[PDB]
Design a protein around this ligand. Structure first.
Ligand SMILES: *[C@@H]1O[C@H](CO)[C@@H](O[C@@H]2O[C@H](CO)[C@@H](O[C@@H]3O[C@H](CO[C@@H]4O[C@H](CO)[C@@H](O)[C@H](O)[C@@H]4O)[C@@H](O)[C@H](O[C@@H]4O[C@H](CO)[C@@H](O)[C@H](O)[C@@H]4O)[C@@H]3O)[C@H](O)[C@H]2NC(C)=O)[C@H](O)[C@H]1NC(C)=O
Ligand SMILES: *[C@@H]1O[C@H](CO)[C@@H](O[C@@H]2O[C@H](CO)[C@@H](O)[C@H](O)[C@H]2NC(C)=O)[C@H](O)[C@H]1NC(C)=O
Ligand SMILES: [Ca+2]
Lengths: 96, 183, 240, 640, 61
């Protein structure tokens, strides 16, 4: 119960660098609630995990801007590397 | 004296005028495909005593002026290069930021007239009015609600709540519609 | 072209939907024609032989035919600007004849070969004008000039990362015969930060009917309420 | 006593019109019905909300047509479900239905099958829904190199294009050869990705075609004559070919090819035809195994190189996949229901094929022990065998053999199947059997549906009507009632077959009553009926001129195109030389109907183990207010 | 299933004032004009969203 309260506190302070160790230990206990006087320990552990899967953040932001900057004036190739098109092969040719 | 085949241009067909075989005195007028404009004034080819007339016409696809992301909004569609000529067919989508709801057309594509199919929408703050619950009366006294604000209501005599008994203000509107069922 | 064309049709109606018609074949032919068999490509300055095969498909009528190879400054043959390359052959009925021409491609790129023919005593002529690719003597090669890791937030200064790419070796490069360097950008995704959800089966026992008095009722209501709240968030009603 | 029941497809699709049939059996007066579809489990939005009234004039049977918008609310990823809530008066009947992400169909047509570096690929994407009707949506297109890396994305619109989307992609001069791919998917359904390939290669047209055609479509392992092969070479314009052919044979084992150098032959091609025989002795000597039985299961491939006497063109062609077999046929029970009704005639759809997989025409088949039950395969290689089942709970085991005369018993094909008894509600022995004469059905005819009832006579008068439903392309096409008089065991339903039944439809009919221990009982039965694959309308391209007039290079010609009024027709003319080089990924009508049938929600030829299995296996969810309902379906894909 | 407005008859009307929707088991009575004779049951009842049979008025001479 105490560790569940603390996890709910880390989910409010946005300290996502300390959350993975806590959650992993909670899963290792295999405590599934229920039983004689499980009320608090059942409510809090599942409330904290439900809040952990809610505040769950998707993927590390990918947004690369790669510009070929050549001293001679011509046409300029700009590139927006986004998450949705990360695998897109962006080829740029230069004859010299 | 026959001329040769006047050749095909990309994205364009031709019809013969004044005859039916590529012979002396025929005209081969060209017309581009749907979404492609007849670039230039050279639109025909006449089989003369030496050959066809000047040039072979060129078809080019019409393009749309790029659109920027609206105030408090983003453009989450199309592809690759930003602020490049969007040509006939390419579609685009708008998605407002968290806390802003779309007010207009959500999508649009590059039309034939070099313009966009629909107009550029706006991103307006999420706002929910006080719902008029049928066979019931509200509990809360607030009229204007921001996002995620809850709206408490009760059902009149002879009625009771259906599923959810309150309403939450989200971007698309109230998520739980205030409804009252028979007892 | 002297071949058979396959015309394919697909119709789309508002009330009838999609329909792919059966292929309609249309064969195109002539009584007399030239089949100019050109290779896909040839090496610059290398002597090659091409064949122009003249076909006469008349049942019982022989043809006295004259065949000519047009002069082209981009190729080398006996055909010059002053003299022509003619030969007067006789093609028997229902038969064919092969005329060999020896040429030497002089300049690279899409060059053109044109062979014409006309028969004596008849209003029957044909011409064939085809193109072939002339390719530099050397062999297509590519060198991996650079492979650099892009990471501005980690390897870059003030948020920008500048990579300097050295010029390619190009030591055995054929004079001129230009090169093309490809700069290939791709993204490196991550997506990992989520803890394994509690198995849905291990929660089957938390659905309990509440009973008892003011305090025991809540003891029975807690596991059921909290179970639905968890299964709703993790979306595990499929396995449950 | 009154029972409210709803039926909805096993899986519900987005942006597609779905029907729901509502019944209130043993009811009087008007019954107000309001159907609402909500998301699962939160019910944040009301996806649909329609109303109807069940009046005695309509026999208390109505339908609700609704189209669920592809809302931005649905999240690989977890599977999504919806809650279907039907309200009849006070009573409410709810069912949780699975949702498929497929928005409809996308078909890609490239002008050619193979392309040279530098040329432009012209392709059209046809955008339709599950009814194959043109729609206007946003489609994402990905160009993919043989390595697998996408090299060009795009997002276009199908609106105001009549369901046809003309696109092009330029091939660079410097490019990697091999099999390229186009990948398109609807914007709303990024999980349903349709693909087409095209080869990129440096080539020249061969100007003629070489055909390697074996005498038989297989090779009998004990045939001393060996594999005799006829070579047929002809120019692309029709005329025959004189030349010389180099023919060589090989044995293929899975993906390991072993050439037989001793079998190499040089034969004259005279009058466009030649013959070369692979002797059995050379075949056995070529392989390092004296036991010929081991060659069974392997295949043979033939490679022929024809050179013209002029020496100006050369064509290599190959014919592989010639199975070395011990039987000319192969029996499959993939079209015969695996459940029977004890005491009622059991129908079997035997599927006899040639070793190469093609249907086999006029093949005698019979059941072991029942020489009387001997049928003949039709044009599609499907035969019908009706047997008489005894009233029993014993597993019905059937063994079908081919009885092709003039063929020895060692070469006759054999296959064994088993069917299980249709378990009834409370062992009441109440069965329903729908039978249909198995024959190629065509649009514009009428099929007599025979409703045959078997049950005790103690409750036979209560059954006054049957409820029949039709499933086509994965959606409810038609529902209705069939009046039945007390005493009649068999009634005939004149079902009018129109173009909306292509390519096939399932007919699942059921009746309900209150019998035995005053329990509400439902008995169902379903049958799968195939229809002659064809277009919904028609489209023919023929000569629009005199066939004395011969086509000449450059000559104008008239093309007669006859099709449906208002239809937009897209054309393409391809040189047959292309197909001599590559004839794969060609858009045909048979392939379109193939895709449609693979997205079907039904998983069985017919019937089921119980009354719920009939609905579930036929792609339907039944849910009554009394509690009789089908089990949930959580699998987008059918069970293996 | 509630009922709707009661059906009108010839040479007669309802004794009360009509409502838009009637709860189940509701009932309204009928009445003919003067010198007309009512035949049948003067009361109709809302059953299964449908009123029962309305009476008829007999024409005098
Ligand atoms: C869901 O439930 C509805 C209930 O209406 C069903 O709709 C029935 O579907 C029939 C398809 O077989 C249709 O019958 C057709 O009606 C044609 C007339 O067109 C109507 O035009 C009006 C415009 O005022 C529209 O509202 C209607 O929807 C129709 O489009 C007829 O020419 C034709 O035939 C008729 O029916 C019988 C056939 O034997 C004749 O005897 C009769 O005299 C009449 O000519 C054609 O069959 C029609 O839409 C409708 N019919 C009836 C009787 O309700 C849906 O099919 C149901 N959907 C599912 C999936 O079950
Ligand atoms: C250059 O591109 C080619 C594309 O085909 C790469 O592929 C190999 O190509 C060579 C011939 O150029 C052959 O050995 C094989 O077809 C391929 N080899 C392998 C191991 O895949 C080639 O690797 C590229 N070279 C460089 C230096 O990037
Ligand atoms: Ca079929």
């Amino acid at each position: 119960e105490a560790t569940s309260y603390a996890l709910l506190a880390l989910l409010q302070l946005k300290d996502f660098d300390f959350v993975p160790p806590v959650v992993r230990w909670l899963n290792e206990q295999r405590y599934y609630g229920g039983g004689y006087g499980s009320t608090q320990a059942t409510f809090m552990v599942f409330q904290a995990l439900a809040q952990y899967q809610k505040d769950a953040p998707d993927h590390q932001e990918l947004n690369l801007d790669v510009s070929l900057q050549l001293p001679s004036r011509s046409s300029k190739i700009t590139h927006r590397i986004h998450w949705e098109s990360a695998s897109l092969l962006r080829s740029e040719e230069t004859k010299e | 004296r026959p001329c040769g085949h006047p050749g095909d241009t990309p994205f364009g067909t031709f019809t013969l005028t004044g005859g039916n075989v590529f012979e002396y005195g025929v005209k081969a007028v060209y017309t581009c495909n749907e979404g492609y404009q007849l670039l230039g004034e050279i639109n025909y080819r006449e089989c003369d005593t030496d050959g066809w007339t000047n040039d072979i016409p060129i078809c080019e696809v019409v393009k749309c002026l790029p659109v920027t992301a609206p105030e408090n909004g983003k453009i989450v569609s199309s592809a690759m290069e930003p602020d490049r000529e969007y040509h006939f067919g390419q579609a685009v989508r708008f998605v407002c930021n968290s806390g802003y709801k779309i007010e207009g057309d959500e999508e649009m594509h590059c039309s034939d007239d070099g313009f966009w199919s629909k107009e550029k929408p706006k991103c307006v703050e999420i706002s929910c009015k006080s719902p008029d619950v049928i066979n019931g009366s509200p509990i809360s006294q607030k009229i204007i609600y921001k996002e995620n604000e809850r709206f408490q209501y009760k059902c009149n005599m002879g009625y009771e709540y259906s599923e959810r008994g309150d309403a939450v203000c989200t971007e698309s509107g109230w998520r739980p519609l205030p409804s009252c069922e028979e007892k | 072209s002297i071949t058979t064309w396959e015309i394919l049709a697909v119709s789309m109606s508002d009330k009838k939907g999609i329909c792919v018609a059966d292929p309609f074949e249309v064969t195109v032919m002539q009584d007399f024609f030239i089949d100019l068999r050109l290779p896909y490509s040839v090496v610059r300055n290398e002597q090659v032989e091409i064949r122009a095969v003249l076909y006469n498909y008349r049942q019982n009528q022989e043809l006295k035919v004259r065949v000519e190879l047009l002069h082209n400054p981009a190729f080398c043959s006996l055909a010059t600007t002053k003299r022509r390359h003619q030969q007067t052959v006789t093609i028997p009925p229902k038969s064919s004849l092969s005329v060999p021409y020896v040429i030497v491609p002089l300049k690279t790129g899409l060059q053109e070969v044109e062979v014409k023919a006309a028969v004596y005593h008849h209003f029957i002529s044909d011409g064939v004008r085809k193109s072939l690719k002339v390719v530099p003597e050397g062999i297509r090669m590519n060198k991996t000039v650079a492979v650099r890791t892009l990471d501005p937030e980690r390897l870059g200064r003030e948020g920008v990362q500048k990579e300097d790419i050295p010029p390619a070796d190009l030591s055995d490069q054929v004079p001129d015969t230009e090169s093309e360097t490809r700069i290939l950008l791709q993204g490196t995704p991550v997506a990992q930060m989520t803890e394994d959800a509690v198995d849905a089966e291990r929660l089957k026992h938390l659905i309990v009917t509440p009973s008892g008095c003011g305090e025991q009722n809540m003891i029975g209501m807690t596991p059921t309420v909290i179970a639905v709240h968890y299964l709703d968030e993790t979306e595990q009603w499929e396995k449950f | 006593s009154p029972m409210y029941s709803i039926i909805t497809p096993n899986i519900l699709r987005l942006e597609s019109e779905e029907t729901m049939v509502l019944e209130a059996h043993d009811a009087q007066g008007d019954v107000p019905v309001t159907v609402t579809v909500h998301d699962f489990p939160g019910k944040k939005l009301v996806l649909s909300s329609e109303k109807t009234v069940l009046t005695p004039a309509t026999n208390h049977m109505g339908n609700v047509t609704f189209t669920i918008p592809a809302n931005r609310e649905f999240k690989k990823g977890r599977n999504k479900f919806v809650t279907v809530q039907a309200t009849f008066g006070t009573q409410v009947v709810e069912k949780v239905v699975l949702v498929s992400l497929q928005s409809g169909y996308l078909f890609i047509q490239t002008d050619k099958t193979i392309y040279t570096p530098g040329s432009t690929v012209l392709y059209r994407i046809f955008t339709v829904n599950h009814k194959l009707l043109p729609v206007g949506r946003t489609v994402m297109v990905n160009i993919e190199n043989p390595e697998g890396i996408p090299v060009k994305q795009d997002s276009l619109s199908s609106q105001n294009q009549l369901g046809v989307l003309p696109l092009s992609w330029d091939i660079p001069e410097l490019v990697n050869m091999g099999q390229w791919k186009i990948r398109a998917y609807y914007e709303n359904s990024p999980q349903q990705v349709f693909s087409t390939e095209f080869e990129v290669k440096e080539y020249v047209l061969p100007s003629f075609e070489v055909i390697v055609e074996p005498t038989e479509k297989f090779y009998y392992i004990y045939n001393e004559k060996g594999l005799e092969v006829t070579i047929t070479a002809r120019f692309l314009y029709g005329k025959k070919v004189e030349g010389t052919a180099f023919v060589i044979f090989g044995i293929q084992d899975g993906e390991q090819r072993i050439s037989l150098p001793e079998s190499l032959k040089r034969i004259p091609i005279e009058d466009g035809s030649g013959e070369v025989v692979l002797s059995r002795k050379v075949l056995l000597d070529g392989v390092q195994n004296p036991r010929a039985e081991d060659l069974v299961g392997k295949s043979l491939y033939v490679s022929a190189t024809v050179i013209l006497h002029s020496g100006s063109d050369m064509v290599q062609a190959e014919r592989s996949g010639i199975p070395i077999v011990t039987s000319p046929y192969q029996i499959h029970f993939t079209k015969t229901p695996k459940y029977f009704k004890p005491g009622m005639p059991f129908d079997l759809m035997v599927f006899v094929t040639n070793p190469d997989g093609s249907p086999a025409y006029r093949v005698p088949v019979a059941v072991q022990g029942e020489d009387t039950v001997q049928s003949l395969t039709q044009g599609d290689g499907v035969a019908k065998l009706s047997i008489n089942t005894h009233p029993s709970q014993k597993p019905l085991s059937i063994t079908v053999r081919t009885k092709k005369q003039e063929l020895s018993e060692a070469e006759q094909a054999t296959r064994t199947m088993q069917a299980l008894p249709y378990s009834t509600v409370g062992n009441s022995n109440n069965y329903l059997h729908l039978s249909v004469l198995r024959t190629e059905l065509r649009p514009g005819e009428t099929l007599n549906v025979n409703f045959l009832l078997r049950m005790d006579r103690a409750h036979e008068a209560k059954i006054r009507y049957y409820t029949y439903l039709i499933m086509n392309k994965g959606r409810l096409l038609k529902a209705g009632r069939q009046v039945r008089e007390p005493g009649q065991d068999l009634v005939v339903l004149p079902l009018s077959i129109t173009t909306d039944f292509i390519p096939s439809f399932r007919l699942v009919a059921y009746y309900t009553l209150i019998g035995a221990s005053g329990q509400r009982e439902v008995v169902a039965d379903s049958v799968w009926v195939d229809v002659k694959d064809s277009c919904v309308g028609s489209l023919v391209v023929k000569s629009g001129q005199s066939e004395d007039r011969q086509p000449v290079p450059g000559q104008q010609m008239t093309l007669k195109i006859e099709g449906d009024h208002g239809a937009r027709v897209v054309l393409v003319a391809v040189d047959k030389g292309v197909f001599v080089l590559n004839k794969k990924n060609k858009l045909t009508q048979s392939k379109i109907w193939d895709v449609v049938e693979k997205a079907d929600i039904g998983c069985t030829p017919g019937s089921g183990k119980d009354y719920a299995g009939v609905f579930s296996d036929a792609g339907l969810t039944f849910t009554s207010s009394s509690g009789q309902q089908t089990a949930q379906r959580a699998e987008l894909q059918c069970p293996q | 299933g509630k009922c709707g407005p009661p059906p009108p008859i010839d040479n007669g009307d309802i004794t009360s004032f009509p409502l838009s929707v009637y709860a189940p088991a509701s009932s309204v009575e009928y009445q003919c004009q003067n010198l007309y004779q009512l035949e049948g049951n003067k009361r109709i009842t809302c059953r299964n969203g449908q009123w029962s049979e309305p009476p008829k008025c007999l024409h005098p001479c």
